[PDB]
């Protein structure tokens, strides 16, 4: 319980606002509502964004208190947030939502025919497995 919390040196997602879908990193908390965030390599500029505007993640960084953009970038490239962030399921969820937004009609036709084929095979296998379960439980 309470595995995550804001911290000097924590990367955080941004859901709402003008920098949506862009990771920031908390430098210091100003007063209860807003934190001075910074982006070394995620194309977002050093500013102050609200906590309800951002979204907390799990990865931490070793930032000194109120360090430069240079030291933020060095700790970012030491921690390797980009490849390790691509290699998780959460970015795959966001990428799948973006691909559903970037579907087309021919892609939906292919998804629907593959959907029909997979659901027919799944229905036949569920029928076969419940038949085998009844045949196992009958003695």
């Amino acid at each position: 319980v309470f595995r995550r919390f804001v911290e000097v040196g924590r990367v955080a997602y941004v859901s709402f606002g003008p920098h949506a879908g862009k990771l920031v990193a908390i430098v210091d908390v100003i007063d209860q509502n807003r934190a001075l965030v910074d982006g070394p390599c995620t194309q977002v500029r050093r500013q102050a964004m609200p906590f309800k505007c951002m979204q907390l993640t799990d990865f931490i960084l070793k930032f000194p208190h109120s360090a430069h953009q240079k030291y933020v970038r060095q700790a970012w490239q030491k921690a390797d947030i980009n490849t390790k962030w691509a290699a998780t399921r959460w970015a795959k969820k966001i990428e799948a939502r973006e691909r559903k937004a970037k579907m087309t009609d021919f892609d939906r036709f292919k998804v629907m025919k593959a959907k029909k084929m997979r659901n027919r095979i799944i229905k036949n296998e569920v029928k076969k497995l419940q038949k085998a379960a009844l045949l196992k439980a009958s003695p």
């Binding site: 799948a96 579907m103 593959a114 997979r118 379960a133």
Partner: protein, 195 residues
């Protein structure tokens, strides 16, 4: 078509606002589990306001005049009456479209219940503020049917457990089928185009 709404953990005014707005458009909405609709404030204040509402009555003839329902479904139906234009054949037709129930009826046992996030206690209220239960208020004043409704509610909860165990067993079986092989050829299309 039909909008079967939960009442467990909702607020009276918020749920009445959303139901009274969505019933004028034509979507036939039914609020089920009306005894669990929470009301903000203190419970002594809520029963004091309801006692004042009972005190409001015509002195020359109490029958011809103010009617004061004690069942919580009819409390919510009066709450939606006081918001719809019920003296005209728009709000009158909307109240004809609206159905309300205490407990859960047997068709609504089978049909899936919706939950409105905009009317929830947790979303709208601070968690260190007091609250009340409309079924508790109704049992305290007038509505003598808590012991029957709670018994039938426990019965349908047992029915829901004995259905959910079978549903979870079938879900484990179909995920064993998905764990099995020779389905990935379509998954090469699907994972690229949003598995």
């Amino acid at each position: 078509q039909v909008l079967v709404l939960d009442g467990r953990g909702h607020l009276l005014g918020r749920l009445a606002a959303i139901v009274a707005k969505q019933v004028l458009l034509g979507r036939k909405v039914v609020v089920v589990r009306c005894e669990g609709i929470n009301i903000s404030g203190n419970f002594y204040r809520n029963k004091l306001k309801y006692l004042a509402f009972l005190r409001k009555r015509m002195n020359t003839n109490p029958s011809r005049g103010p009617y004061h329902f004690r069942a919580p479904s009819r409390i919510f139906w009066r709450t939606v009456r006081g918001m719809l234009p019920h003296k005209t054949k728009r709000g009158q037709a909307a109240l004809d479209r609206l159905k309300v129930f205490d407990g859960i009826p047997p068709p609504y046992d089978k049909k899936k219940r919706m939950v409105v996030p905009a009317a929830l206690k947790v979303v709208r209220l601070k968690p260190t503020r007091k609250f009340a239960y409309l079924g508790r208020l109704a049992h305290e004043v007038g509505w003598k049917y808590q012991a029957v409704t709670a018994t039938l509610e426990e019965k349908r909860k047992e029915k829901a457990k004995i259905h959910y165990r079978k549903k979870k067993q079938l879900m484990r079986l179909r995920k064993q089928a998905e764990k099995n092989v020779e389905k990935k050829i379509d998954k090469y299309t699907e994972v690229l185009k949003t598995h």
